[PDB]
């Protein structure tokens, strides 16, 4: 993430000294990269408790959600995001069936 | 109503199993006995 903000600026370095015939290369304003928003990314009932073909209604129900990048209340985006491998975190208790 | 588990177990699913384990020791195929 912040490790990024440099490589934009190296290669912005090597077309400058390289043409100066045409100057002021553009660049986009600071809070196109910092506002997360722009980007797609970012009473609860104990689920144990329900019957099956009710559970099945309501994870596809998170599920649509999550599709479209949308936190999902029984199934959570892990926010680690770490080197580039995107992981999600599914509520514990479950039925193992619908959960694989 | 039991056979609605055997029409997803065509399907993978879990009501029954194919544990990736050593015959009965851990492999095992969900019943009742």
Known sequence: ?100 | ELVKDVLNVLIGVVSATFSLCQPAQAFVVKRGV
Request: aromatic share 8%.
């Open chain 1, 1 to 100: 993430l912040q490790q990024s903000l440099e490589l934009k600026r190296k290669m912005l370095r090597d077309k400058q000294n390289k043409k100066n015939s045409g100057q002021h290369l553009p660049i986009f304003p600071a809070w196109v990269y910092e506002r997360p928003a722009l980007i797609g990314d970012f009473t609860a009932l104990p689920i144990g408790t329900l019957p099956l073909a009710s559970q099945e209604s309501a994870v596809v129900e998170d599920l649509l959600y999550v599709l479209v990048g949308v936190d999902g209340r029984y199934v959570s985006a892990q926010p680690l995001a770490g080197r580039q491998s995107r992981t999600f975190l599914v509520d514990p208790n479950l039925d193992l069936s619908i959960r694989e």
